[PDB]
Design a protein that fits this description.
The structure is a homohexamer of 253-residue chains. Chain A is of the alpha/beta class. Chain A is 40% helix and 16% strand. Chain A starts with 6 loop residues before the first helix and ends with a helix. At the A-B interface, α2, α11, β8 and α12 of A face α2, α11, β8 and α12 of B. Bound molecules: calcium ion (CA) (2 copies) and cobalt (II) ion (6 copies).
Chain lengths: 253, 253, 253, 253, 253, 253
């Protein structure tokens, strides 16, 4: 076998990718999302009740479909990153990155020694298909994509430094965490927040990195797409399930 | 503790109850559905990948919420009915009931001896709260509700006989199974099928039993409500998840 | 490896075995029970939320301990009996056996062809340890023990006939199901029920079969032991958990 | 989406398909098997500790790979067949089929009314991808493959009648169950058994049906392939795991 | 919906709350405990085999009952605290807190920015009921209760400083960990240990914080209640299961 | 009950122990491995998709068999070590140990206060059998075995210092991680790497500690055994499953 191509990583330089947040934490729910035709599915290890085993189940579900899997771990924990890479997550979104030093550690966490600190266990990994991908240890990093979240004042305070870290492919803006950090908790739509978000996207693209964001607001998501944002998540499965069931009940109260 | 009141059973004679089909087969997904405010939630053991243990998890999720749980077993299997009653399902929807003889057996499957054939195991059952409901064996049947599905030609051929079975509280019409049985598979909206459905509802109500149905077609569900149908399911969680995710993506293709 | 010796089966002719009912339906809870030192543990597939996979987990937990496992399936279903024997259950307790014909079918369900109708799949079975027990197909029935429950009027009406079925090792009396069948539901302690139970135990032992019963009443269990009853369960894990927690709270209300 | 093509069904008339038995009962173990390149993988619901939910997990694992999934239910149970078809199993292997009457019932169990008795629940089914395959109810049977097992004397006594049932695509010979049925339990390699197996394969192919078999004996599997047998399973995952680990330990004792 | 009121938090100033330790690590076992009527149930993530997903199941089980859930994470890990708050745990018990600096970090871990460092993900959280609690981000901290454990010499060495940390609602004394720290491992009943425990309880209450403790010794628990200790756990589900089963067997040996 | 004897620990000074790596992450797969007769089974928490609960299931499976269980956590995390010891893992293999300071912390993580920092929770632990091992808190450390991995340049740079840490029973060499650290990633068989491995084994044994290693290369494993290496793992379950299934298919292509 040849390594699974990371089409998400390739498309960061070629097109705008439309994303769905997957927080239903379940292989069956992930499969339903995988049938829709999103460019990418974010399997949320930070804000949905997921662990390594439930994330594997959702990777296996999604693998039969063209949608690309991106995994968010609960934090930039180097041993957890090792685990998520070995179950075969090729794209990682690290929350709350706040310095070039932390971003560089996340780069190393995704690369084998001697260049990085990724633990070597290819015989056991779905990532190498249990060594059925015969050159995995030589080729693996070619198909690994590292994304970091800037979603705090310290992140924005270190934005230019993070954007100069080789091996950070993309910076993703978290409007919920960022708006809270700016004293506008629950109000990311405020002009003060939006102006910082737009300027941040412009600086990310000016440094030649992919910019990303999540907004369930269609008008905001379209504006971010108009600015050239490379990876835009446009909704959340738990939110769409709850809203569609409420909207239906309201037709009958 | 006193037995859990079956408000679904009580409301069959007092109001029209709006239902959501739950086929996401998961305690977390059942909890999301429970937050919406449907009168009843159908935990589908027939057409979703559920077993006794997954149905228990969804009963436990839903129990904290006013929505009433109704469980559909895969078939009118007497030992499976015993299991679903012991985990505390108070309302059952039996598929593909086709004779008064079978409807009578389903009544007995829901009642303790000497009147019925429900197996006795109160010490172990969530239904008795492990005997914390101290008079459970004397009071249990008062809060059990039996619904049967008429959804085949043989069902319709035995409708008057099923409607004279004491202890059948409601007859639910299955438009997918019935339209297929009538040679209109995938086309329940056909006049031939709808005239049979309307007449069946009228006959159910004329015999003093509750009529029920599922339609994801808003206009059909409203017409069934105008005919006085007591329990109408208006949607399915898997369908609402898939449709809402497709509708969202099409705003961005 | 040699087949696991069924010490429960051997002890039916040599001693009185003290049993605990296991309905907490979980490998961790079965392990706690296994540490106590009961002669036997009944893994309840009829009245606890168990399936083949949860029964297997509890067999694996209990296997490290001297307590012998007995499995009760939800009904005398021949394919389920096949499944439970292949995961390695050596003793089965069949509920609600009501004729010699049914008891004979249960004997056959436990024996390989050409004598029986047990399906042959030793390569896949924990029962053969995946053929690591090299003569399993020749020796298996030697360590299989069949118990049937008499717990209905039809059972008592067929008692002498069931007691003449070769390969039924034991008849277990179900006081909850039997007292209900006799119109004394929730009142097995009634003299009318107890006289029938005592005569039934005497008839079982006079036919040279093992007699069994469950009573959480200490005085009743001791009387059954004084009558020579070979296998007596004296309590239920759910009941002991709930009672011990209620008794503790009442010291502080 | 268009229905998933059943390449196993198509290849019954075009090539000889090499099969692996999957009894490790686990989505992760199924995925390892799926990477090898077998024509087909038999997910064993009869002799491995599987239920509908574990079979779904293994279908989802295997779906990303060219290996075709075949599911064996525990018995020819019509409601269980309904469940396995709805989770999207396109090929079923029914154990212990013994008459044309039972084989015809298995055909109907796989077809929608009005021709068959398959329960209609497409909105909820992975089989229709939750109605994302828009014509599923019209096209489904085109990609459904029914295989039946002849593995008893009554089966052989009804072989010519089973082979005249339209909609039986293949007859699979079970050498373990059949050798036991013939009084050669654990000795399928005996000439008396092999001569019956060869004659049975010849009669299956002469009636224009696909013949199938499992043998972990390489010489027997090659002989069956030389006779023109269309689907040959050549090993079992539990057996290969145990034997490879024993063979390795013996190099070091 | 309005936020779930934290009655445990309210009752810290109004009454003495009787608690049960829940380490059976299972939704079914947590439900049995919830039926007893304890003021609070401690879901033990530190010393029972629990993870985020098993804690969620137990929160769902307990939610239908008046008993208030308190969750103990394995350590004061800020990302894990984030996960446990998002699945809807409103009261946390942090083990082995040893400084005001650590206690202050635990306060921040429980509060949204800009005041705290709790990660913002309300759309995905059971805590907000997937935003069905419409003002969750504004009101959440009102119903969050932080308890810290003092159970080491360094803890006692920093007791006055921890007791001056605003947002620590309660200090829980761990007699097993503390007695071990004092060189009296397995001997918390020693006078040297008890005098330190009594003085610690008096100092906690003098600083206007709630004092808590666990003792399975009835005499010790009653003395702690007489001292005015606000939250006293009086037993452990694993201990009561094992003891009740041992005590029963000993009546029959 | 007396504490479970750690025969692995005892045999470090009396014989050479042959090991199998268990990364199939499942109680059923661990049981198959346990039937083979390996001296020890490595339950891999670092490079297989295991968590505390899956590791418990595999401990419970293996417990009925003479094979000794050794657990590798994902990292030298003190709270995770506490969890794995409480579920009853008596031998731990800590990855990527790089200093005497870290090795000393791992020793303390395995010992109760006042000597160590292992959290005290015997009532809840399978390790004490829920206090059914009555003197557990006094005797536990006698049967705990700590192994550390040297598999980086910093490890080798601190080898003499790690080898002088009392309570480190064994140093295990990780050829995959070490060969990558040395710039020979995927090529541990290189002379440069092997000369370092041989010298490291000699130094470990000269300091009176047990040396260990994994090699799936039979000739390398036999050479390590000839050098006197005390604990040698000779294969991996995922690798043996994949290779045996590939080797079988290639006989038929
Ligand atoms: Ca299951
Ligand atoms: Ca888990
Ligand atoms: Co964020
Ligand atoms: Co229907
Ligand atoms: Co009974
Ligand atoms: Co067979
Ligand atoms: Co403590
Ligand atoms: Co390593």
């Amino acid at each position: 076998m040849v390594n699974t191509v990371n089409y998400f990583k390739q498309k960061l330089k070629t097109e705008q990718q439309i994303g769905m947040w997957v927080g239903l934490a379940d292989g069956y729910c992930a499969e339903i999302a995988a049938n829709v035709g999103y460019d990418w599915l974010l399997i949320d290890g930070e804000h949905a009740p997921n662990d390594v085993r439930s994330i594997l189940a959702q990777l296996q579900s999604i693998a039969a479909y063209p949608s690309q899997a991106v995994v968010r771990p609960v934090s930039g924990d180097v041993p957890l990153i090792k685990q998520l890479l070995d179950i075969g997550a090729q794209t990682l979104l690290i929350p709350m990155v706040e310095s070039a030093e932390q971003a560089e550690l996340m780069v190393k966490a995704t690369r084998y020694p001697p260049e990085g600190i990724r633990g070597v266990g290819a015989a056991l990994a779905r990532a190498s298909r249990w060594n059925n991908i015969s050159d995995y240890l030589q080729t693996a990093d070619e198909q690994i994509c590292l994304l970091v979240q800037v979603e705090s004042k310290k992140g924005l305070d270190n934005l230019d430094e993070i954007l100069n870290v080789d091996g950070v492919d993309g910076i993703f803006i978290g409007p919920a965490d960022l708006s809270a950090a700016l004293g506008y908790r629950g109000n990311p739509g405020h002009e003060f927040v939006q102006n910082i978000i737009v300027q941040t996207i412009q600086k990310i693209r000016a440094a030649g990195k992919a910019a990303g964001i999540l907004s369930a607001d269609e008008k905001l998501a379209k504006q971010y797409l108009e600015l050239g944002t490379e990876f835009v998540a446009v909704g959340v499965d738990t939110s769409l399930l709850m809203k569609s069931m409420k909207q239906l009940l309201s037709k009958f109260k």
